[PDB]
Structure 1
C-alpha cells in the first residue's frame, strides 16, 4: 500500500534511480549524476510529496545510511519477485526505445510511460484511493 522499493541501476555510465510501488508495479525513475545520498534524499522528498510513502525497501541497505537520507525519511515520516520483474521490464523497454532519443534520460522517461500505461498506473490510483 505504502511500500516502495528503490534501487539504482547503471547504463551508459549513468545512474538510474528506480522506485517501484510494490503492490501495483508502478514506476517512477530519474537519471541522477552520481549514486549519492544527496540525490537519494532529494528523490525521496519528491516521491513522498506525491504518494503516501510509508516504507522503503532496497537491495542495497548501505544506500540509506547518509545523514541526508536519514533526514528525508525523518521529515517525511518514512521507515525501512515483483520488483525484479518490473526492473527487468523497464531495462528491456529502454533498450527498445533507446534509438528514438539522443539522451538516455529521455529514453528512460519514455520507458516509464510505456511501462505504467501497459495498467500499473490505473492500479496504484485504485489502491491508494480505496485505502
Structure 2
C-alpha cells in the first residue's frame, strides 16, 4: 500500500498523515514518502509538545500543549524554578510518552540538568524564541481559554488543583471537534496506531 501511496503522492502530493490515514501504512513510512518527494521538499509553507509557564491569579501553572492533537496538561506550580520543572517533566514524562519539545529560553528549561534530563529521558529539547504560527496560535489560545475555563470552574471547586483539573477535563476530554474528536481522541488513536507498527519497528530500527 506504501507503493500506491507514493504513486498517489507523486501524483497528488498529500501529507504523510493523509497517506498514513488513507492507506493505513505506518506514519513513518508515509513520512518517508513525503520527505523523499522533491515536489514536497521543494514546496513547504508526533508526541511533540510545547511549554510555557503562566500565572493565573497569582498561581503559576506549568502548561504542556501537544502541538498536533491540541491535547493539554497542567498542574499548579509553586515557582518557575528549574528543579520544580525537572520534577514536573519526570511526572509528565510518566503521564505521557513525549518524543520532542519546544519552549522559550526561560530559566527552568535552558537549565543544565534540565537539558540533561531531556537527554537522560532522551526527549529532543529545542530552546529558543518560538517562531512558529503553527504552535503559537494554538498555545496562545490555549492560555486564553484555559484561563477562561479556570475563571468558569474555580468558583465551583474547593481546591484550585481540582478546578485546574476541571479545565484539563473539559479541554482534553469533554471538548470535541471534527467528528467529535477531543484532543485525547487524536492522541490515543495515534499511539494505538503506533503500537502495531511498533511491533514491526523493532525489526525496522
Structure 1 length-normalised TM:
0.89
Native 8 Å contact 1:4 1:22 kept in 2: yes
Matches of 2:124 and 2:168, distance apart in 1:
26
Count the aligned residue pairs: 130
Tell me the distance in 1 between the aligned counterparts of 2:98 and 2:187.
12
- Number of the residue aligned with 1:72: 117
State the Cα distance separating 1:4 from its structure 2 match.
Answer: 0.7
What's the C-alpha RMSD, in Å, of the aligned pairs?
1.5
Deviation (angstroms), 1:120: 1.1
**Structure-1 separation of matches of 2:162 and 2:97:** 27
Matching residue of 1:20? 65
Unaligned runs of 5+ in 1: none
- 1:22-78 Cα shifts (integer Å, max 9, x gaps): 1111111010111110111111112222322121112x2124122331232121101
The correspondence of residues 1-131 of structure 1 with structure 2, limited to 5 A, is 1-58=46-103, 60-62=104-106, 63-80=108-125, 81-117=137-173, 118=175, 119-131=182-194
Contact kept, 8 Å, 2:74 with 2:164, in 1: the verdict is: yes
Report which of the two has the higher share of strand. 1
Higher relative contact order (CA 8 A, sep 6+): 1
SS of aligned partner of 2:124: coil
Does the CA contact (< 8 Å) of 2:56 and 2:147 recur in 1? no
Deviation at 1:9, TM superposition (A): 0.7
Q: Which has the larger radius of gyration?
A: 2
Deviation at 1:99, TM superposition (A): 0.5
Deviates more, 1:16-25 or 1:66-75: 66-75
TM-score computed with the length of structure 2 as normaliser:
0.59
Question: Which whole-Å CA distance do the structure 2 matches of 1:101 and 1:68 have between them?
Answer: 36
Gapped runs of 5+ residues in structure 2? 1-45, 126-136, 176-181, 195-205
